Amino acid sequence: EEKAKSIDQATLQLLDKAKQDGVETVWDRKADMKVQCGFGSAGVCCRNCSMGPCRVSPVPGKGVERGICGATADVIVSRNFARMVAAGTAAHSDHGRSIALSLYHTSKDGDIKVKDENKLKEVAKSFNVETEGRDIYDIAHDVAKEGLSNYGKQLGEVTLPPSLPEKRKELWRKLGVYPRAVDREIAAVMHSTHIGCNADAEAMIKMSMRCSLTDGWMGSFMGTEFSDIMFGTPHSIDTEANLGVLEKNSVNVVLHGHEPLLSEMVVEAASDPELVELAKSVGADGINLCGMCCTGNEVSMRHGIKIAGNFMQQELAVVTGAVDGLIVDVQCIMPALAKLSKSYHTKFITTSPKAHITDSIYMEFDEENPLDSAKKILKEAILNFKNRDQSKVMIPELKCKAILGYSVEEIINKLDKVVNTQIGPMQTVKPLADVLVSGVLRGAAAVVGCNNPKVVQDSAHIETIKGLIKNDVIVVVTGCAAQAAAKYGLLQKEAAEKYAGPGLATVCKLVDIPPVLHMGSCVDISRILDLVGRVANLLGVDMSDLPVAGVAPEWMSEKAVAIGTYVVTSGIDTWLGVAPPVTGGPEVVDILTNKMEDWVGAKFFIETDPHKAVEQIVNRMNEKRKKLGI
Amino acid sequence: EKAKSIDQATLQLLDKAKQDGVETVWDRKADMKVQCGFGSAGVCCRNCSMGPCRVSPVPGKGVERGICGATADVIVSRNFARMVAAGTAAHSDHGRSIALSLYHTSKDGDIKVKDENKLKEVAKSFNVETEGRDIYDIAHDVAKEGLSNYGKQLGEVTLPPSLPEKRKELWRKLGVYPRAVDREIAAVMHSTHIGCNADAEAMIKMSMRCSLTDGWMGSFMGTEFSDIMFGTPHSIDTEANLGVLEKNSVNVVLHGHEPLLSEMVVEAASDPELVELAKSVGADGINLCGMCCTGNEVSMRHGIKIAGNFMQQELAVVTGAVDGLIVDVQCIMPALAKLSKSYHTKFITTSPKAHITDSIYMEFDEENPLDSAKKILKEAILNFKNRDQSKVMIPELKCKAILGYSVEEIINKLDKVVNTQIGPMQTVKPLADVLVSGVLRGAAAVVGCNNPKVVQDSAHIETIKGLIKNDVIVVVTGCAAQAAAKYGLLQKEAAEKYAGPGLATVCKLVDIPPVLHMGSCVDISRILDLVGRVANLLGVDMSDLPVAGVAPEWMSEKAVAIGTYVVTSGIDTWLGVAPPVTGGPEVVDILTNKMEDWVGAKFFIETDPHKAVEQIVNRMNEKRKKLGI
Ligand code: SF4
Ligand code: SF4
Ligand code: SF4
Ligand SMILES: [Ca+2]
Ligand SMILES: [Ca+2]
Ligand SMILES: [Ca+2]
Ligand SMILES: [Ca+2]
Ligand SMILES: [Cl-]
Ligand SMILES: [Cl-]
Ligand SMILES: [Cl-]
Ligand SMILES: [Cl-]
Ligand SMILES: [Cl-]
Ligand SMILES: [Cl-]
């Protein structure tokens, strides 16, 4: 009768417990919202000044046509869209900015240090920083200074990655969307969306495209590249996923958020002899560290830390009654966790001055003394195990194995296994390019995205991934979408025979990989751009000429909008499972889902049905294959 | 039905607009009927696709939290902070463009260093050497240091000297000291994103830190660098209101905010070739008029007649005499594109930052600025040939006004009341003297745009008139200054007609009107400078002086950023239009109560201007008693 809440049995079990406990969840608050405002849902409501609030008609020819200022529905909708990109870009901007500042404070006998010297030497080449006969920390600081300039330089040209084809750069230049400093483009969009500024849908949407580029090729890239320098480049690693990872007799410390420095220090803190003994003093087996959302992906990729769950599972993790400490930093942390943690012994600890949540324990993460600060927070979670009500604990016995760490460096290393020593070249993406041109693999898709109560949890993610791998399309995943697959069991070597098509199953067996490749967090989507870029450069074509696609089956965050925008602007078609608020703007719908193709060689596709989406992705990929002659 | 405006010229053309069958901002306001109450109270959130969400502004009843679990106070505080971030961004790009122009100055170039003295003083603030060096070498170094304040990630930002050290340490202690301009905008846009900040007090403090990068930096730099290249304003005469348009002349109206284009269109209007072209088409000459901030910037430095303010822009086209309406960015109603189709007027858009569909687009080349301005102005001149003199109607109503009261000019004027054998010269001591003596009960700043929720110019005039009667010297900027220019308060004659005993006496001695026009809103930085200078001269903080700010009819997000930095700077601010904060009880308490305990000043929302004037006078007397003056 009522639509299912989720496809995961562990999620469905804890949802029943939440009802019996009397607590409210995101699914319950969705029902409370009832019918959602159509004006806001169509994007035709404007609040960019105090002359309104204005609400024009989404159906042209009837109702109120213009806003008080004169803005038409297309103007209102295009500005509303722009601001989402600018907000999404800002979330990834501060993320990478913080990583770069950490790189600037690295020392040989310090809490934060350079782990991957080889990666730093390569990154230093792109930023024009010398490496010959110099201290790795002196290079790291000069690189950090050059990287930080990309955020607010007002003169000169910005440094872009080598994987970005020159054809794509020239296309942006001629279109007028070449990126500038990161914070500069955010201000540019915010200024033009102000009352009495831009009133042209095409120009506004182009401003968002320019802004979104500073996220994917600058904010996220540097965030990913510098994280690999300081914490290590990820490689194929095993781990367990789903809420079944929590242990009843151990202290459970769940890390949620996005910033990787705090989670890297809580991992090291879990290995301090004093803290391991304090856990035993309280009556625990040990310290069971778990992750959720990006911060969890960033730790499972590098240290194989177990994943508790994705975005909409964050409330149900507390409902298990086994989370002693829930340490959060920034982004995608539902404020409900403060009210929910009151009904349990769980301690909700906020650490970033960027994300303060009312009625929550606030323990600021001292970046000057990071390891000491991490130990102080972890100690509080350990001591809280004393207040655990073991009789009311209920951790569903449902976990799944998964393989991740599939960075571009790791994928290239694995592809070397299928290269002949006497013929083929080494450490290049050629094996992947060869399989795509031949036609063994119909194409390569990137399923990324969040969880939305408008879609059954994980339903569209699994249906979409399944359908693509069945049609010989290798799938790469990141963020909550990657976790959704890890929970189902698609991130396993044995998933190739079970779900992959004829060609993909052959490639999986030869290269020895699962049919779905976990490439990391949403910031790690820059690795997908890097991979697709290398394939394009190796074949001497632009990214728009390859049979590639991006999918966001379930998405909410303004970050997903910026991600989609920079993916389409980079030349990769993107399918959206959740419809953005553009319905009321006919010109905006035409631009996003049609005219855009003429500007960047790619377009948006809105499809809520995942079965129809895979049909469209395959047909579109084939169209691009026929044009290229492959 | 309520009156649409108090100005007779405006009411006359509103009748013509009806007869011509054209739409105006007032018509579209009526069409919006009962505007939404969730958006009005600020309890509607669209920061993620899980929404839209709408909680109840009335605690206890209706939906309590959003889908993510965000309470009303969070939703309201995030919505308020985004208004500040947007307002700050608008001024940021304005000043940034000015700093880039300062970096491209040349001895034999279109953009030059007109005020060398000001640049030398500004160089001291940025720690740039000014001894035995080319003025353009100093200008480029000052421009580079100014540009750093927009995106420096390491080190501290440079703030102007007028800012008291007490105020700086107070911001530091509160955690709202300013970082780079664009960096702070990113910080607000980030913390407002789903799953980030969910504390009203923290969010409102983040917005205050962001707003400070607008007043003491972008707006301050924008004003300072503009005075260097285009000249520092001094007392000048001009005429205001739509009566300034001439039926037998080429009427070129400059609307917008950017000053470089306007400055170049003025220089272009003197090109012999363009002067003769105006004669070839059969005109008396080139009648240059301005509107909104851009019109203020040109009227402050060149006395260019002011056609009107924000809600009069459509009515300027309705006269049927505007041959060319050249625009750039900020507050250029998009309605002008459709409205211009009913008349011969050529609506020209010149900025890639503000493209408007169905408008003639002539990009203003910043590499060849004078040649670019000449090419745009030529199109406006040639359009005179397409005028239909039978459908023209310019109200025979204009007003004389005096403006150009920069801090330098106010000080220069105050030196005439200083004995050659006692007080120092070029200081604000005479103004602090009258304020401490009690002759001037205080000093209020009336700034702001125009909103259909309020009768056009009604609150501006009633507030200004009421403050000057109660011996409170009034300083004005933007549409509020233009409103006063049209009424006739920016005249020396207005002191005897509308000012109190003390203020009328001071006006007679200093030889000034009772209301001083200090420029555009980027020129509100002059108000901060002036108040800051008085605070430093008296060895106190800005929150200790009997000063206040008023926004009787605001609407722009810039106005929210202005108000926020004015309160954060220590000056109490009154709002004539209620912002979208009603639905957040904690947010209301923070802005209108706890803020006083954080920065020594708070917000006051009052729609009735007569009540607002009483509240301002009482609050000033309260601060005077605490100081013993
Ligand atoms: S503010 Fe807009 S989106 Fe929100 S409830 Fe009102 S009309 Fe709908
Ligand atoms: S900018 Fe225009 S559409 Fe938006 S609230 Fe203001 S008058 Fe209405
Ligand atoms: S921020 Fe919260 S209340 Fe707003 S749309 Fe998102 S989930 Fe809903
Ligand atoms: Ca890079
Ligand atoms: Ca393995
Ligand atoms: Ca701490
Ligand atoms: Ca100065
Ligand atoms: Cl390669
Ligand atoms: Cl009327
Ligand atoms: Cl019209
Ligand atoms: Cl006409
Ligand atoms: Cl002084
Ligand atoms: Cl009157």
XYZ file of C-alpha atoms in Angstrom, chain A residues 251-535:
285
model
C 32.991 0.738 21.741
C 31.431 1.988 18.493
C 32.789 5.335 17.249
C 30.953 6.414 14.070
C 32.677 9.119 11.978
C 30.302 11.163 9.802
C 31.008 14.233 7.662
C 33.449 15.068 4.845
C 36.769 16.487 6.172
C 39.469 13.718 5.962
C 42.051 15.181 8.419
C 39.879 14.613 11.529
C 39.080 11.021 10.469
C 42.753 10.289 9.672
C 43.648 11.440 13.233
C 40.815 9.499 14.941
C 42.200 6.374 13.143
C 45.709 7.011 14.538
C 44.214 7.834 17.980
C 42.479 4.397 17.999
C 46.009 2.877 18.002
C 47.311 4.753 21.106
C 48.099 2.118 23.798
C 46.488 4.249 26.564
C 43.190 4.478 24.653
C 43.143 0.770 23.775
C 43.569 0.024 27.534
C 40.921 2.604 28.541
C 38.414 0.738 26.290
C 39.149 -2.494 28.218
C 38.848 -0.588 31.570
C 35.228 0.303 30.644
C 34.420 -3.344 29.747
C 34.808 -3.326 25.947
C 36.600 -5.731 23.582
C 38.283 -2.844 21.744
C 37.622 0.281 19.657
C 35.355 -0.368 16.639
C 35.806 2.584 14.232
C 33.097 3.037 11.562
C 32.464 5.561 8.803
C 29.470 7.126 7.062
C 29.116 9.179 3.837
C 32.295 10.792 2.373
C 34.407 10.879 5.582
C 33.749 7.120 5.733
C 34.730 6.570 2.086
C 37.971 8.551 2.545
C 38.990 6.182 5.426
C 37.749 2.904 3.860
C 39.708 3.745 0.681
C 43.043 4.315 2.504
C 42.779 2.197 5.690
C 39.967 -0.290 5.001
C 37.840 1.084 7.877
C 34.378 -0.518 7.841
C 31.419 1.529 6.432
C 28.319 1.793 8.637
C 26.077 3.270 5.932
C 25.176 6.117 3.556
C 23.308 9.475 3.889
C 19.733 8.353 4.894
C 21.134 5.622 7.191
C 22.824 8.172 9.557
C 19.716 8.382 11.835
C 19.151 4.600 11.931
C 22.793 4.124 13.043
C 21.920 5.907 16.342
C 18.656 3.845 16.603
C 20.826 0.662 16.964
C 21.609 2.017 20.461
C 25.245 0.903 20.010
C 26.810 4.205 18.822
C 28.730 5.487 21.857
C 30.280 8.447 20.023
C 29.095 10.082 16.770
C 31.841 12.520 15.721
C 30.766 14.885 12.896
C 32.668 17.622 10.966
C 30.810 19.256 7.999
C 28.204 18.754 5.203
C 25.345 16.196 4.912
C 24.966 15.922 8.746
C 21.183 15.992 9.371
C 20.482 18.449 12.263
C 17.923 15.892 13.567
C 20.860 13.897 15.054
C 21.007 16.390 17.960
C 17.338 15.696 18.953
C 17.622 11.959 18.147
C 20.788 11.430 20.262
C 18.786 12.660 23.289
C 16.577 9.504 23.264
C 19.753 7.325 23.417
C 23.108 7.337 25.296
C 24.837 8.305 21.997
C 27.099 11.412 22.270
C 26.699 13.773 19.250
C 30.070 15.621 19.064
C 30.400 18.543 16.572
C 34.032 19.551 15.782
C 34.115 22.129 12.952
C 33.394 25.843 13.656
C 31.846 25.845 10.118
C 29.062 23.442 11.189
C 27.753 24.168 14.705
C 24.630 22.177 15.659
C 22.478 23.357 18.606
C 22.169 20.949 21.596
C 25.285 18.971 20.640
C 28.599 18.393 22.411
C 31.085 20.770 20.740
C 34.740 19.730 20.790
C 36.606 21.932 18.297
C 39.294 20.083 16.314
C 42.575 21.915 17.049
C 44.438 21.929 13.702
C 47.612 23.072 15.531
C 47.717 19.860 17.676
C 45.600 17.496 15.506
C 46.515 14.089 16.995
C 46.156 15.359 20.592
C 42.780 16.945 19.719
C 41.605 13.677 18.097
C 42.617 11.671 21.197
C 40.585 14.016 23.471
C 37.429 13.483 21.377
C 37.925 9.714 21.036
C 38.454 9.421 24.836
C 34.988 10.949 25.427
C 33.362 8.356 23.130
C 35.180 5.494 24.959
C 34.088 6.726 28.407
C 30.476 6.992 27.137
C 30.364 3.173 26.673
C 29.697 3.157 30.494
C 26.148 4.478 29.751
C 25.303 1.822 27.114
C 21.952 0.053 27.748
C 22.952 -3.373 26.341
C 19.389 -4.740 26.775
C 17.957 -2.208 24.272
C 20.846 -2.558 21.727
C 19.821 -3.980 18.328
C 22.439 -4.166 15.559
C 20.914 -6.060 12.554
C 23.170 -9.039 11.697
C 23.505 -7.839 8.081
C 26.892 -6.825 6.625
C 28.508 -7.211 3.180
C 32.096 -7.464 1.877
C 33.502 -4.886 -0.566
C 36.688 -3.923 -2.464
C 37.657 -0.245 -2.961
C 40.786 1.929 -3.336
C 40.336 2.128 -7.095
C 42.190 5.381 -7.728
C 43.517 6.261 -11.235
C 47.015 5.113 -10.162
C 45.589 1.808 -8.866
C 43.394 1.205 -11.940
C 46.435 1.777 -14.202
C 48.510 -0.662 -12.052
C 45.778 -3.345 -12.381
C 45.418 -2.754 -16.145
C 49.203 -3.417 -16.511
C 48.454 -7.124 -15.797
C 46.784 -7.431 -19.242
C 49.719 -5.703 -21.073
C 52.259 -7.769 -23.104
C 55.856 -6.995 -21.973
C 57.322 -7.279 -25.524
C 54.649 -5.075 -27.160
C 52.272 -2.913 -25.090
C 53.516 0.210 -23.213
C 53.240 0.313 -19.381
C 51.576 2.546 -16.753
C 49.088 4.036 -19.259
C 45.289 3.798 -19.672
C 45.761 2.059 -23.076
C 44.193 -1.321 -22.021
C 40.998 0.553 -21.049
C 41.040 2.668 -24.239
C 41.651 -0.500 -26.345
C 38.676 -2.369 -24.805
C 36.367 0.654 -25.410
C 37.339 1.239 -29.088
C 37.134 -2.498 -29.895
C 33.577 -2.646 -28.543
C 34.097 -5.376 -25.884
C 32.946 -2.764 -23.319
C 30.044 -0.743 -24.730
C 31.151 2.215 -22.562
C 32.018 3.536 -19.103
C 29.451 5.104 -16.743
C 29.891 6.932 -13.413
C 27.035 6.389 -10.932
C 27.430 9.002 -8.157
C 24.826 10.732 -5.968
C 22.988 10.983 -2.602
C 19.791 9.571 -1.003
C 16.431 11.322 -1.469
C 13.067 10.464 0.227
C 11.428 11.069 -3.189
C 13.153 7.771 -4.312
C 13.141 4.398 -2.460
C 16.526 4.348 -0.634
C 19.204 2.681 -2.862
C 16.489 1.453 -5.256
C 17.512 3.666 -8.204
C 21.245 3.279 -7.399
C 21.189 -0.543 -7.590
C 18.708 -0.757 -10.521
C 20.843 1.765 -12.461
C 24.231 0.128 -11.715
C 22.826 -3.369 -12.403
C 21.368 -2.397 -15.796
C 24.560 -0.687 -16.952
C 26.941 -3.544 -15.992
C 24.529 -6.053 -17.619
C 24.856 -4.077 -20.914
C 28.708 -4.308 -20.844
C 29.180 -0.798 -19.403
C 31.926 -0.667 -16.733
C 30.573 1.364 -13.789
C 32.646 3.592 -11.460
C 31.035 4.834 -8.218
C 31.659 7.459 -5.518
C 29.926 8.829 -2.361
C 26.594 7.438 -1.161
C 26.022 5.722 -4.522
C 29.266 3.718 -4.022
C 28.201 2.837 -0.484
C 24.734 1.751 -1.743
C 26.519 -0.749 -4.073
C 28.889 -1.874 -1.264
C 25.839 -2.666 0.945
C 24.137 -4.684 -1.820
C 27.295 -6.607 -2.720
C 28.149 -5.321 -6.204
C 31.679 -4.296 -5.104
C 32.884 -7.925 -5.161
C 34.941 -9.922 -7.662
C 32.117 -12.536 -7.825
C 29.559 -9.874 -8.870
C 30.969 -10.060 -12.446
C 29.624 -13.591 -13.156
C 26.423 -12.816 -11.229
C 25.494 -9.498 -12.940
C 28.032 -8.383 -15.610
C 27.396 -8.837 -19.334
C 29.501 -10.968 -21.715
C 32.246 -8.413 -22.428
C 32.456 -6.793 -18.990
C 32.609 -10.222 -17.288
C 35.567 -11.107 -19.567
C 37.391 -7.818 -18.747
C 36.651 -8.298 -15.010
C 38.204 -11.769 -15.125
C 41.289 -10.667 -17.133
C 42.039 -7.500 -15.090
C 40.869 -9.215 -11.818
C 38.429 -6.533 -10.590
C 34.724 -6.261 -9.619
C 32.231 -4.952 -12.267
C 31.743 -1.765 -10.149
C 34.819 0.293 -9.165
C 34.720 2.397 -5.973
C 36.829 5.470 -6.836
C 36.335 7.280 -3.490
C 34.342 10.219 -2.068
C 32.385 12.859 -4.068
C 35.544 15.059 -3.992
C 37.162 11.948 -5.503
C 34.836 12.371 -8.570
C 37.877 14.392 -9.843
C 39.533 10.920 -10.290
C 36.714 10.046 -12.748
C 37.391 13.293 -14.672
C 41.124 12.385 -14.562
C 40.485 8.858 -15.904
C 38.092 9.980 -18.680
C 40.601 12.739 -19.553
C 43.570 10.357 -19.922
C 41.494 8.084 -22.218
